[PDB]
Amino acid sequence: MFENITAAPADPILGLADLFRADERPGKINLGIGLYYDETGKIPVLTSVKKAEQYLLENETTKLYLGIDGIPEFGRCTQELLFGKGSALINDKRARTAQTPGGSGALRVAADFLAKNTSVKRVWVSNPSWPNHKSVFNSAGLEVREYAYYDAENHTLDFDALINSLNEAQAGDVVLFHGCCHNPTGIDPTLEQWQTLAQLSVEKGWLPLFDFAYQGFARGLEEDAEGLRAFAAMHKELIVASSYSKNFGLYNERVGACTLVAADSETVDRAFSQMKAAIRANYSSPPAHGASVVATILSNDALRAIWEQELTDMRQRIQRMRQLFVNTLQEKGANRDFSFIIKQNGMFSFSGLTKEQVLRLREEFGVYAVASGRVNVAGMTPDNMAPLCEAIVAVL
Amino acid sequence: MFENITAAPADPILGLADLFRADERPGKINLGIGLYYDETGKIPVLTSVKKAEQYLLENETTKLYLGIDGIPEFGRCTQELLFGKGSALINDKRARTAQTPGGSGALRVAADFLAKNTSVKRVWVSNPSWPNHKSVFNSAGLEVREYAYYDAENHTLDFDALINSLNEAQAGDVVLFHGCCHNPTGIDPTLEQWQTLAQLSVEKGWLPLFDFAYQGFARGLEEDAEGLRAFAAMHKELIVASSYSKNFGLYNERVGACTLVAADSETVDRAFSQMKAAIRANYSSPPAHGASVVATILSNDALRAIWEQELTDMRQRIQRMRQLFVNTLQEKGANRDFSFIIKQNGMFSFSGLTKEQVLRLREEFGVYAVASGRVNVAGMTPDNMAPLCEAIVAVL
Numbered sequence: 190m191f192e193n194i195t196a197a198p199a200d201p202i203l204g205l206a207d208l209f210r211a212d213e214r215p216g217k218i219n220l221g222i223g224l225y226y227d228e229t230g231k232i233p234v235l236t237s238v239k240k241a242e243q244y245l246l247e248n249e250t251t252k253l254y255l256g257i258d259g260i261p262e263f264g265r266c267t268q269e270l271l272f273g274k275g276s277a278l279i280n281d282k283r284a285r286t287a288q289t290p291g292g293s294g295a296l297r298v299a300a301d302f303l304a305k306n307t308s309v310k311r312v313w314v315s316n317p318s319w320p321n322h323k324s325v326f327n328s329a330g331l332e333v334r335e336y337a338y339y340d341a342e343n344h345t346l347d348f349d350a351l352i353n354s355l356n357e358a359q360a361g362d363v364v365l366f367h368g369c370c371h372n373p374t375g376i377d378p379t380l381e382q383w384q385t386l387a388q389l390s391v392e393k394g395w396l397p398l399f400d401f402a403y404q405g406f407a408r409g410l411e412e413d414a415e416g417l418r419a420f421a422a423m424h425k426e427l428i429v430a431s432s433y434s435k436n437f438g439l440y441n442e443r444v445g446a447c448t449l450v451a452a453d454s455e456t457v458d459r460a461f462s463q464m465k466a467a468i469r470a471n472y473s474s475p476p477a478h479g480a481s482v483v484a485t486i487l488s489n490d491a492l493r494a495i496w497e498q499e500l501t502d503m504r505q506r507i508q509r510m511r512q513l514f515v516n517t518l519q520e521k522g523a524n525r526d527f528s529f530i531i532k533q534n535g536m537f538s539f540s541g542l543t544k545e546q547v548l549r550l551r552e553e554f555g556v557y558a559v560a561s562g563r564v565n566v567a568g569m570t571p572d573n574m575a576p577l578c579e580a581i582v583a584v585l
Numbered sequence: 586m587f588e589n590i591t592a593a594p595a596d597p598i599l600g601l602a603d604l605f606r607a608d609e610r611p612g613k614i615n616l617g618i619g620l621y622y623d624e625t626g627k628i629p630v631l632t633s634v635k636k637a638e639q640y641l642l643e644n645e646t647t648k649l650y651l652g653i654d655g656i657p658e659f660g661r662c663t664q665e666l667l668f669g670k671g672s673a674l675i676n677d678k679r680a681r682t683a684q685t686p687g688g689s690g691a692l693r694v695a696a697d698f699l700a701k702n703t704s705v706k707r708v709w710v711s712n713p714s715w716p717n718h719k720s721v722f723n724s725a726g727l728e729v730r731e732y733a734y735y736d737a738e739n740h741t742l743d744f745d746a747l748i749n750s751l752n753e754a755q756a757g758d759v760v761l762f763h764g765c766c767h768n769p770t771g772i773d774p775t776l777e778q779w780q781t782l783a784q785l786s787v788e789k790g791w792l793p794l795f796d797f798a799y800q801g802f803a804r805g806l807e808e809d810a811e812g813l814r815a816f817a818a819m820h821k822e823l824i825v826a827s828s829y830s831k832n833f834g835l836y837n838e839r840v841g842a843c844t845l846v847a848a849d850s851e852t853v854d855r856a857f858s859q860m861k862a863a864i865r866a867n868y869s870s871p872p873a874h875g876a877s878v879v880a881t882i883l884s885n886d887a888l889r890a891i892w893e894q895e896l897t898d899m900r901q902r903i904q905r906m907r908q909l910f911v912n913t914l915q916e917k918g919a920n921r922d923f924s925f926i927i928k929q930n931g932m933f934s935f936s937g938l939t940k941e942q943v944l945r946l947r948e949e950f951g952v953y954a955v956a957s958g959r960v961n962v963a964g965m966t967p968d969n970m971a972p973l974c975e976a977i978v979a980v981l
């Protein structure tokens with residue numbers, strides 16, 4: 190029955206980790222997958238987290254199934270993180286949150302939900318975008334179309350080209366936005382542009398879906414939510430697929446959430462009940478661990494304090510790594526100018542190397558980047574910075 | 586966009602959880618959802634589990650993403666527990682295992698895989714069956730048909746009906762089987778009946794799918810795997826969705842596995858690549874916690890010894906509650922004769938109660954059972970047995 194199955198091509202991201210973990214080369218450098226690395230080159234468990242886990246070890250008394258939608262407290266905290274402590278969304282009880290296995294699980298949950306309870310047929314994703322977006326949506330039976338975004342010869346956000354592209358989107362179409370830290374470009378809309386898109390989308394009748402996986406890595410917690418918050422003030426309905434993988438260093442515990450908003454309580458409850466049915470036919474209930482971690486920290490004043498500090502440290506190192514990177518490129522006598530890299534934000538930088546420069550960088554020097562030329566700046570360290578820049582310069 | 590969404594009906598199982606939580610009557614009794622309770626009435630965290638957890642707290646240095654298929658050790662152990670220590674399956678390298686978020690997530694992973702890579706169009710589930718089977722499969726765009734199973738009158742396995750009904754399954758159809766501890770009848774075939782079924786299925790051309798969620802609750806780890814093992818010797822291709830939720834008391838951590846078997850190593854490999862693609866478009870990678878716990882305990886001779894005893898205790902306690910239940914029923918007044926209950930395996934007995942009788946026990950005596958009349962014997966304690974057998978008798 191399987192005699193005919195065809196071999197799938199491997200994940201452009203997840204697949205590279207396999208090649209990586211296979212070269213027996215001494216000085217290999219991994220700048221592919223979106224992990225945060227410290228000065229010493231490791232991917233540490235944060236301390237606030239270790240503290241939270243200790244607490245859990247002492248205090249848990251049962252492993253009793255969670256409800257479909259997970260931990261209440263977790264949902265509450267996510268909302269305020271998301272909309273504000275103040276908010277009317279929260280005040281009017283307009284939103285409902287489901288804890289899912291990572292922000293990947295939330296995307297799928299939303300897709301399954303949309304495909305089965307709405308008249309949605311297409312979803313609009315930026316170009317370029319996170320490669321898994323297409324697979325998730327196609328998996329639910331939805332079609333994906335792209336909208337212009339990135340201005341390659343200037344490394345910018347091509348606003349009108351983005352807007353003109355969107356004019357092709359019909360009313361009732363889904364349009365996907367990246368909260369902040371655009372993956373893989375690192376180019377984000379300003380607050381004005383966010384406001385414009387908000388208005389437009391209200392006129393054109395689109396349903397907004399925000400992919401929020403980097404809250405806190407651009408400028409800060411509250412200010413990273415600005416774009417989302419502007420949309421929220423104008424819309425009656427929207428979906429937020431959020432992740433705690435990067436901001437809590439909880440990658441393998443799978444912690445994310447799916448937030449549903451409707452014009453009002455009665456509607457949202459009705460709507461959510463179906464979202465629940467979609468979950469039940471998937472993984473049933475969500476994994477407690479990582480989510481208990483996040484709820485514990487967000488719920489405790491001390492731990493939260495530590496956590497925020499650990500987060501601000503993460504963000505700053507990355508910003509340091511980015512200046513260090515171009516300066517060194519410079520000193521190493523790089524052809525082009527790479528100063529645009531200083532303007533982007535988050536873990537990734539769109540380097541501008543070609544398919545075959547990245548292919549070369551790898552076969553030849555053990556430097557691992559994603560085919561699109563996306564580079565993980567958080568994987569860079571003062572110790573690997575020269576060898577790195579020396580390889581790049583050698584291929585350009 | 587969400588204005589016309591209709592409210593979903595509640596889950597026969599999970600839904601009761603909700604009502605239970607909200608019921609304020611003091612002496613309530615829960616015999617709904619499949620959770621193991623102790624003499625004192627709690628869902629405790631096993632000792633071997635708390636140990637393994639301590640070990641993790643101390644030894645973990647990273648939260649790094651696991652791979653699509655999870656922790657290699659986990660899969661290795663799972664295959665041994667499943668096929669036995671030195672199986673040819675393991676030796677020939679025919680099976681491949683993916684770690685999933687519970688047995689639920691394994692079921693779904695298999696459905697998505699099947700629906701997309703094979704020409705499978707329909708799935709055969711027993712009557713009666715675990716309510717969620719239907720939903721998972723339908724979600725994948727698969728048809729679910731039913732096969733005769735239980736004989737209500739003499740409360741037993743009707744082999745002819747079972748056999749005669751399958752007679753309509755076509756070649757290339759999936760036939761789903763319960764490893765042991767039939768949910769919800771508690772009626773399992775004999776080894777001899779297992780052997781018969783194993784021959785038909787081959788002759789007839791079916792693709793067997795085993796739902797294995799109660800390994801260890803019938804007779805023992807190995808004994809419990811017989812039917813599966815007999816199937817494994819004749820078949821070329823097989824699917825296994827297993828759960829560690831009940832045998833490890835790890836309910837909310839979501840630990841399960843999906844094992845894919847092919848005629849050979851190359852085929853299975855090729856096939857598994859697709860299964861992996863299906864997972865990437867779903868939740869990406871699995872939750873580390875509970876799986877780490879399982880691998881830790883299975884790979885350490887000492888922790889393993891403790892666990893197997895903990896598990897033996899569970900099974901034993903349950904069988905005690907069985908006989909206590911009938912005796913008390915009788916000596917307390919019952920009209921009917923519930924002795925058939927002594928011959929079922931697992932957490933659950935099919936009580937023979939009416940939809941009206943279960944509604945009533947709920948509404949009137951605070952006793953929670955599932956509408957089909959399935960009761961959780963493992964939710965019964967020596968302290969609640971009195972008031973319980975009284976409620977029942979009063980509705981007879």
Ligand SMILES: *Cc1c(COP(=O)(O)O)cnc(C)c1O
Nearest residue numbers: 291292293319372400402432434
């Ligand atoms: C990492 C990432 C995701 C998926 O997040 P997980 O929490 O790892 O499932 C989704 N979208 C973007 C833009 C991401 O960077």
Ligand SMILES: *Cc1c(COP(=O)(O)O)cnc(C)c1O
Nearest residue numbers: 687688689715768798828830841
């Ligand atoms: C419990 C159970 C499952 C799913 O269990 P998980 O909690 O997701 O591991 C599947 N099938 C049967 C028959 C079960 O009893």
